[PDB]
Design a protein around this nucleic acid. Structure first.
Ligand SMILES: Nc1nc2c(ncn2[C@@H]2O[C@H](COP(=O)(O)OP(=O)(O)OP(=O)(O)O)[C@@H](O)[C@H]2O)c(=O)[nH]1
Ligand SMILES: [Mg+2]
Ligand SMILES: [Mg+2]
Lengths: 63, 125, 51, 285, 65
RNA sequence: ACGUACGACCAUACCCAGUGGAAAGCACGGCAUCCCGUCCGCUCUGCCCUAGUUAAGCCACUGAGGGCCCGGUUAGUAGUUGGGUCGGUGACGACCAGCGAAUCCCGGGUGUUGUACGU
RNA sequence: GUCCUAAGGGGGGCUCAUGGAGAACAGAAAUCUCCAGUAGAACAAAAGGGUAAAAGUCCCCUUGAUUUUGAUUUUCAGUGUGAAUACAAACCAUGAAAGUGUGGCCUAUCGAUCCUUUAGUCCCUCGAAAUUUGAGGCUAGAGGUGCCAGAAAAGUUACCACAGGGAUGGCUUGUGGCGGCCAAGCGUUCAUAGCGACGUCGCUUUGAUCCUUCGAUGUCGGCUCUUCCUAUCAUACCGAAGCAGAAUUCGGUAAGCGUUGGAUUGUUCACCCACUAAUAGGGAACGUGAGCUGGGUUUAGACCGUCGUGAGACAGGUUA
RNA sequence: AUGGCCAGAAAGUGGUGUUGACGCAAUGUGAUUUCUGCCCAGUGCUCUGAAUGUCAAAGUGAAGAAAUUCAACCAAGCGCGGGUAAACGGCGGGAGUAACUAUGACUCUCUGUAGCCAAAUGGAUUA
RNA sequence: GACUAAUCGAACCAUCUAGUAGCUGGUUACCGCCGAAGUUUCCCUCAGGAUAGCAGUGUCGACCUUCAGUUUUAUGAGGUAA
């Protein structure tokens, strides 16, 4: 059977879902800068974050 | 067990075994299980399809066939000495004896086959 | 723990999601969005229609 | 609670994990001296924001029966009490009463000196702004008793009275007023309450030089009758609730500085001494 | 939406498994359920992570995760 | 000391009536284009500070009737417990204490004060 | 039985019940005006001190009817982008602002022609007669799943058997989708909107990298032999290209004539190497289907893996 | 052995049994070589250890004129409390303590180009 | 799950027994007069029911009242063209 595929009007569709502050961005950039690798630690749950705004840019010769 | 405790929220964890052919993936599964649950042979490509083995209630093991990632610098001699292929199905198996004689020390070969005094692989064979 | 809560814990009845329990439904015949209950709810349908 | 405002009132009066700022009720007895009224006025001026005030005469003796005090606490949602009274035997009494679940947790009596008392208006200084939380300094050897006594309870009452609203941050301009309570281990010792505004000066280094100036009131007390709490009620009152923002530490689970959940594994020492290698034909002499 | 995935070696097959025939988004840190308890099959070839999104006001189209 | 603007105590400040108020300040006031709002420029809002006026508001003082606020007396007394007690068949009659009133009566009073700017 | 752009929230203005004195109808009781009016009205609760330029009452704005995020709290999850929940933060509403406030409340279900229970003295019968208990009938009441009883008759068969039924199409082909702009034209010219080809613009490595191959429910093959189509690989002819020659490339007419061995079954058997003029693609089955013969493939025997207490079933793998 | 395992409708009935633990019966595994991931104690196996908690029939007491009703007493098993074939099953370690026994709970931190040691060999890559 | 006289996931023989089936197959001269039917309404649906409606034979009643898938007239709906 074919359902009625309809979308209700809602104010939540036109708002921002995830926001971040500049201080939080600076803290995450510093954490990314001082991040180190440990073979005896595993990753269990990634944090949903703007990696494009957090991680550093490429090298100038590559750019 | 530590991995299962770290993933206690899931119903179980799955441990897939990867590597080249004849590195001992099915043998490792059999040793962890304590019982011959996966087929084991010295013939490469014995495991052809993926297989689930219940190790514990919350631990599964997945046997996988052996993979060889392609490289432009890998030679057929290198693959054969890595154990990728079966030597029954290769053409002119005699050409790979110098690689074996380079890899193996001479006195080990002499005590293995009780044979001394060859100038080359032709005379050794 | 109330009688319903004890019964649901015994019978494995999960709580409804917030999207599932919304006071909103789509009426096909009118092609409009209406409320299930409350003011002009769907439980009082036809109490004010002419026929 | 049919009305929404009434529902808001009951939800405000409901028990919480993080409790509301503490409310004190200032009330009088049937007979109360003018010096006691001035003392309660000074304490109310210290604690205007979180206090309510009665203006009638109440026939209450707290050390005989405190049913009316419990009723007032339940009705007004006040849980600290300052009861003023006067008598021939005790001329100027301030009865500090602390509730727990709308019943009497504990009580203490303070006896005000009529001669050395000076109100806030007696000092010609700049006064404390309304709603500003002062700092506290407790001095002397009377507050370090190994057994809980009247001085320990009085220190608890005064800390709870001048607690104000807790906050994780404070402006450096909100460090201008201090309340100092001095009391010595001993016929009865004298507990002295003073308030000082702080003037700060240069001293040639990073830390500044602190100078004080009296702000008022000037109060001297003798500790009198004391009603101790029940041990079970005291344990239930000193139970500490945990905030949902206070996480529960799990073994080998942490959160890194990027917010990822990180698990720890432990390999142990590799001991290959108990391994027997294969006795191959080529390895035999 | 769902086609029946048949299992078994008999001529008659069990038909409890369903395969999603439309593109899906599985989210981060995704591990598939084991085959004994995987009712819904979302194949790896039909998984998408990015989309071409247009801003109606800015009149631009950018590929976004 | 007086006035004004913010206040603190929140009747000693409230209810009623009478008399007076230099200076300045408040206030009554005058005018409805613009801002603004009403059934009504009554209120609110805008413009004038000129002209009249202390008539009212405001302040001071007086006067009754109330009310209110202090101190003594009541009184360490009624009343409530300890049941400490001396005798007593025991109870009771008495002391010893710990808390602790109120009515009635007497006397006094009818606002103090902070900051800033002025007279 | 009628009524409502719901309640709630924020802001602003005003003061109520009553008493006295006044006003055509209006006369104890209709409305208007003044004065006095600590609330004696209203609204919530059950003060022994709730609220007066308000928590009362009317105006203005929102009404979007239960927002988003969370590595955190608690519970759960064979459908683990987690869900519900608590808390926090952001957002939102209002206001000049200080601020204030919201982003729900609950509950197993089933009978009422049912279940439990009470009374009849002057109600009937207990059939050989009478009395007393007891029982049945008939009649009239009470209450409503806390105290109104109860609501637990499963699988498997690949060891098998029987009775029967059953076994989209004048489709397709060579050129993407979404969004914007332009646009010859169509309409419109009391509205100047709306359809719109041709186009164009955004998203989908300096000849690199080779350290990213992304899931069988859908089954094909092989010989042996004949024929047909053209959507032409070669051979024949022709047109064009810096096509000098040679070798070609793009295209046209053309099915007359050919279009081959071979390797690889750890496997979607599809790709390699060679000879060659060239090693073109399809149909006549696959819109179910008796030539032969390997795989999809599967009666009965058997192990191994997964599930199940088990009979057995499968994510599966192997053998006859 | 006044036994176990069976059989028969029963029997003064039969077998094992012309038997007696180097035996009989039931299971599982399946020559030899190798071989027992580490630790428990949730399900289960078994302890006549105290209880009446559940508690049938028969039997006992009371009321009534009796039918009848109400009471205790109440075997085994179950329940409670102990040890395991520790079989199934669960089980990431090591330290501490304030709990003091089961369940603890609250912190800490864990990563030899052919040897050595074992009664010639170090094996299942088993003829 | 092999064998137990070509018979075995329960042998053969006779009887109960003409066992049961809603499922399959079949069901025997002619002419004449009529002559159909698919949510109407109610019930928990499938492995469901009744029921309305439509028909034929007989009759009987004064086969009495006449009624009619039609138009017109009056008045509604469609005021919509014009
Ligand atoms: N000496 C020694 N030999 C080993 C060990 N492990 C495995 N082998 C041998 O190596 C061979 C490995 O065969 P498998 O167990 O099938 O390993 P595999 O990689 O799964 O083989 P494929 O099926 O081809 O992929 C076996 O024949 C063993 O004899 C080991 O630990 N020591
Ligand atoms: Mg192998
Ligand atoms: Mg293998």
């Amino acid at each position: 059977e074919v359902p009625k595929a309809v979308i209700e009007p809602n104010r939540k569709w036109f708002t921002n879902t995830r926001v971040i502050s500049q201080d939080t961005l600076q803290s995450f950039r510093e954490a990314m800068a001082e991040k180190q690798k440990d073979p005896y630690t595993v990753l269990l749950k990634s944090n949903k974050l703007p990696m494009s705004l957090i991680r550093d840019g490429p090298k100038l010769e590559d750019g | 067990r530590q991995f299962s405790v770290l993933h206690k929220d899931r119903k179980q964890i799955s441990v897939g075994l990867i590597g080249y052919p004849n590195v001992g993936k099915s043998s490792i599964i059999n040793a962890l299980r304590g019982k011959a649950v996966a087929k084991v042979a010295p013939i490469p490509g014995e495991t052809k399809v993926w297989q689930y083995v219940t190790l514990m209630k919350r631990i599964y093991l997945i046997d996988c066939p052996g993979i060889v990632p392609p490289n432009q610098h890998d030679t057929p001699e290198d693959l054969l000495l890595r154990g990728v292929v079966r030597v029954e199905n290769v053409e002119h198996p005699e050409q790979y004896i110098p690689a074996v004689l380079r890899k193996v020390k001479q006195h080990h070969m002499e005590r293995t086959y009780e044979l001394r005094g060859w100038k080359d692989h032709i005379e050794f064979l | 723990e109330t009688k319903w809560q004890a019964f649901a814990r015994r019978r494995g009845i999960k709580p409804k999601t917030r999207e599932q329990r919304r006071n909103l439904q789509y009426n096909p015949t009118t092609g409009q969005w209406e409320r299930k209950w409350g003011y002009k709810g769907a439980n009082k349908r036809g109490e004010t229609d002419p026929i | 609670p049919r009305n929404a405002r009434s529902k808001r009132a009951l939800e405000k009066r409901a028990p919480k994990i993080v409790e509301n700022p503490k409310t004190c009720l200032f009330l009088r007895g049937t007979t109360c001296s003018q010096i006691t009224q001035d003392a309660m006025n000074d304490l109310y001026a210290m604690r205007q924001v979180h206090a309510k005030r009665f203006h009638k005469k109440n026939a209450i003796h707290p050390f005989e029966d405190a049913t009316s005090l419990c009723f007032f606490s339940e009705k007004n949602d006040c849980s600290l009490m300052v009861f003023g009274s006067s008598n021939k035997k005790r001329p100027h009494t301030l009865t500090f009463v602390r509730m727990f679940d709308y019943k009497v947790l504990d009580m203490l009596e303070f006896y005000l000196d009529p001669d050395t008392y000076r109100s806030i208006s007696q000092f010609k200084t700049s006064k404390i702004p309304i709603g500003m939380r002062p700092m506290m300094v407790f001095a002397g050897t009377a507050f370090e008793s190994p057994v809980p006594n009247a001085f320990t309870m009085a220190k608890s009452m005064l800390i709870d009275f001048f607690r104000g609203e807790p906050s994780d941050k404070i402006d450096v301009e909100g460090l201008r007023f201090v309340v100092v309570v001095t009391a010595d281990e001993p016929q009865k010792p004298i507990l002295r309450l003073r308030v000082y505004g702080i003037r700060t000066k240069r001293s040639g280094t990073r830390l500044p030089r602190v100078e004080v100036e009296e702000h008022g009131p000037r109060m001297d007390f003798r500790l009198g009758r004391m009603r101790e709490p029940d041990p079970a009620m005291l344990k239930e009152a000193m139970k500490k609730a945990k905030t949902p923002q206070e996480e529960r530490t799990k073994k080998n689970i942490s959160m890194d500085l990027l917010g990822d959940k990180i698990g720890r594994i432990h390999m142990g020492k590799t001991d290959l001494s108990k391994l027997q290698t294969r006795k191959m034909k080529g390895l035999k002499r | 939406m769902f086609k029946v995935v048949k299992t078994g070696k008999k001529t008659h097959k069990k038909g409890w498994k369903r395969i999603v025939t439309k593109p899906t988004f599985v989210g981060p840190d995704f591990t598939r359920r084991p085959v004994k308890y995987e009712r819904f099959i979302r194949p790896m070839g039909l998984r998408y992570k990015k989309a071409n999104v247009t801003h109606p006001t800015l009149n631009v189209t950018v590929q976004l995760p």
